[PDB]
Symmetry: D3
Subunit: 237 residues, 6 copies
């Protein structure tokens, strides 16, 4: 066990999907995994391990924000043999042409956190995903008839920002989605020598206030999970 995960080596697969919401980890395990067992419940951060098309896969919540997800991803990598993290989450859009229910793949993640400056001698660390994992996710989405956008996320420390002006800056520089984790996960992956990827579905538009039907939103969420799971199978080959 580690300070935030009451489990032993082998309880997790070498790939872990991670939503922010632990109740979504339970949702994913029940919906997509066969023979799924709960393997962590410390602090309510439910984690599960099962199989997808015979392949051992884990899913566990990471909580909200860079500090929370940095704890869980570190401990998985250093003590549970985890080689790949796929964050599966929601994000807010700032670009007009990025629509509700688009699937966004974060090849990079900008941030207003200081954690990577702390790692990188106060210089600019480009927080990036693993290229092969990005390619696997693009290819899995194509096989499913979903065309994902690949680009930069912005990982914010303040969901309730005082700086409304920063959203115009994100739009100017082409940020595809705003979430709260990717840059921290990518920093952990680089620090501890593992691989990570963040996929998000667009849940909100800071530009055009608008909302679709729940059935359509939930379909797209499941499409993101299918993309993540099928991308693992591609990487295995």
């Amino acid at each position: 066990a580690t300070p935030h995960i009451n489990a032993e080596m082998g309880d997790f697969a070498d790939v872990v999907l991670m939503p922010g919401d632990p109740l979504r980890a339970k949702y994913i395990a029940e919906t997509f995994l066969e023979d799924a067992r709960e393997v962590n419940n410390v602090r309510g951060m439910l984690g599960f391990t099962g199989t997808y098309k015979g392949r051992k896969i884990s899913v566990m919540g990471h909580g909200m924000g860079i500090p929370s997800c940095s704890i869980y991803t570190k401990e998985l990598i250093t003590d549970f043999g985890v080689k790949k993290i796929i964050r599966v989450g929601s994000c807010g859009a700032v670009l007009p042409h990025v629509k509700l229910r688009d699937v966004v793949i974060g090849m990079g993640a900008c941030t207003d956190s200081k954690v990577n400056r702390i790692r990188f001698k106060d210089h600019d660390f480009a927080a990036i995903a693993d290229f092969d994992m990005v390619r696997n996710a693009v290819d899995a989405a194509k096989a499913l008839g979903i065309d994902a956008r690949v680009g930069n996320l912005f990982s914010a420390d303040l969901f309730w920002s005082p700086d409304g002006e920063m959203f115009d800056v994100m739009e100017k520089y082409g940020i595809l989605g705003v979430e709260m984790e990717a840059a921290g996960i990518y920093g952990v992956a680089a620090e501890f020598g593992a691989k990570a990827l963040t996929i998000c579905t667009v849940s909100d538009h800071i530009r055009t206030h608008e909302q679709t039907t729940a059935a359509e939103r939930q379909t797209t969420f499941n499409d993101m999970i299918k993309i993540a799971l099928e991308s693992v199978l591609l990487g295995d080959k």
Copy 2:
């Protein structure tokens, strides 16, 4: 309701105690509150409302890290009429004379987060608790015969810090405990116009491991909760 709290105005008391762990909020509601009802379970972040000695009191987890607790404390302040937040958490000691299970009251909170620089035009915002709440907690602790040290916490973004030498700097400057929230809660309280206090118990020593037993953790946790609850009653006078 708000994006992370499925409740309505009136469901929360005007004072909310907040551990990081939602399961500890459940324990506090079951152990210390009469007629406790669950008022939130979104993302598993359990929150409850009941009475302590006739006084309406709420307790809700805030998750780990400044970004997580900033979400919950903001929404409580802006949409649920919450006037006082008392974080009741754990922390790690860097000072040799600060012992396991000591109670620490954070009159100020240092941090390596950027959130207060974003608020404060990149200058030094001294993230401080409400003085009256600090005095109430000191007095409540004295009435219970519990020692309590008052001073600075350090709110870290990285539990697994790559900069071990910074602990020497914390120690040099008298930091009483390392946790991950106080400076963010104090920044939210100032931004959104409420009052806050962080109380912690020393759960680990960052230099010396110092293992504790389960029965000792519960006694000291209960002591911290008693201090917080009794401090509310003092402030009501």
Copy 3:
């Protein structure tokens, strides 16, 4: 002697009250101290030692600005056995409800100086007063029937600031008074191992001019000095 104080160990009491203006130190010695003797005049920075109600007390100017007061407070701590420093100064208000001649107690001090970043590895050091000294000043003020607000000061490097908009940010974050020393004194106290408190009277309003008379300044100055001196007597118990 030290580079800026021509005195020897024992010439100062273990508590030193410090206005910015050396002429105010002379006035304090003449008005409040019995058997006062001058113990320093290097650079005209007048310092005196006498007794208040039998208690040995010193009073010495510290000059204007963090660099100036950091010199004097350091040398007092390291070479003259000084244990407590009480700055007794003036400040400018930014909050509409903070009135001229109000007494403000700086439990914390914000700043735009770099001195604490230099100390604290470029992170946020919360520059705080000693809690017991804060409580002593609150209690002494209550015993004298004088109102006193407790909260954050802002210690500015530029009295003539080129950034007028920053006063809106100070006001937003509840800053009670703008002065030029507290955050530096609190940083010295932490660095060199002593205790400090800043008390100020609102001498000007940064928005509204608000002129005062000479007799009102003296009464309120005397009130601040009485609070400081009586707070020492409370701390001795």
Copy 4:
């Protein structure tokens, strides 16, 4: 014309290859392009436009360093309709497993320049390539029997850095090559809404030392240019 390019709209292809050494532009034009014409000569920064397998391609040097290449890439994008920039350069390696003459593709670029902080309100902009361009280069290299590594470059402002220890940090965080341009090119591409990619060959191992032959270096340079040119054809699908 623009301040640094004496040409008119249409004189450049929508894709420009850019070496750092201006002498390589004429070499690339004569060796790889058909029907090349001269389109710029100001400051000796010769530019040429021709075709590769029928596809219009331009080539022009960018000069050493982020400020130099930022000038040329901006003017090409805003006044010459350029949609894709491929930098073709050399880099130094810090990783033991990265060998001399290896081909490195910069999906991201770290930097110690301030240019992207100036752009991005002093936050962390992840300077990234266009994903399709990255994959095109990977696939073109594979078709040529060259395995390319994809990851982070580091774009240095100081070739002669006074901070040797930063190379250890680069190694820890997996930096594949050190050059002086990619992060600046990627920032320009994001600022003005275009696409860019940096491909480098390893010319030195910064912390070890060993050499190659002139014929080996020419073969490897030619390989890089073939990868770049064939990658464009793949992008045209």
Copy 5:
């Protein structure tokens, strides 16, 4: 009058010499000026006006540190018609070849203060003297047979620095003397459209602990004052 100078327009000459120590301003006026009158005594910061070889000249202390001298120099420029400030002070040496009693002229001043970053949008403002004033001082020193060194000063915020390492950095980059004011005076001069110069005598060596005779030190101090006064006469022609 201004908040820190109780005088009226005309009471000061259009050139003011400024030592840090107000008792030194009295020393300079009595030693070098004819018909000298005291024109300020607020906060004990003595200022005087007299004639040197028939030329109207003022001398007034500026206190220790950038915040103190920034107050006095601003108020002189904006409200007393002062066109030129000459700081005349002491400094500590870090270079081996810079000796006790050398005269140093600060054509530039480095600093660890934040005041110029506040003025200059967090970029690097090169805090420089007025060229003509530098040339006048060099020429006056030559006429007196003193060969002054012209170069960079370092203006420190902390006389008692915690960062001993910075002195090696100053030596590496050729800093001639360490004092506490020049960069702030030069920032004020630029902000308010006036001219300034700092001259110092070397009073201490952070390298070679050593001291000369008082008679020789005082001779060199008077040489610095003569250089400053004669340089004004050169500028007048």
Copy 6:
């Protein structure tokens, strides 16, 4: 030889003039030097060595931007015995009184580059010229009937700056010319113990607009080179 200069010790004079445009080096050699010989050609950065009135002088371009000119000036100082660098370039003006074709001498250079913060532990290094070189240029200009302005340049990293408002700040603080090199050259000179000077002619007024003739621009360039060369002879006293 060095990585960017294929020459040996003695091939360069101890004084090197450096334009930004590499084509100007050959022009300066043919127009002003006697007996010139070619001493470098790598990357097309032609260097020449000859004599001016019997005095050995070299000329070689430095490329655009701080990183480019930092490479060449470092290698000249550390491997070719170069003692003085004179940059001879153009700049844009922000002050209304600074006219097209004015000669500006940069006694200091502000910057938005990070290179000197990297050198100087993130403090403010005042990037300054050598004083004697400044005065030599002023005196040589006066002997040629040219009045030169001496003050601060601003060395920009982005010719195409996204922050137009910074030009207002430059104007307020008296910046004479905007170019892209001086602060970097001055930092190298300080780092490696040599001397440097930047002279520029005003080629544009950034916030207004108007033009000159080709013959006027050639006359003004020739004037600048004559000033530079005659200033060297004055320095040799």
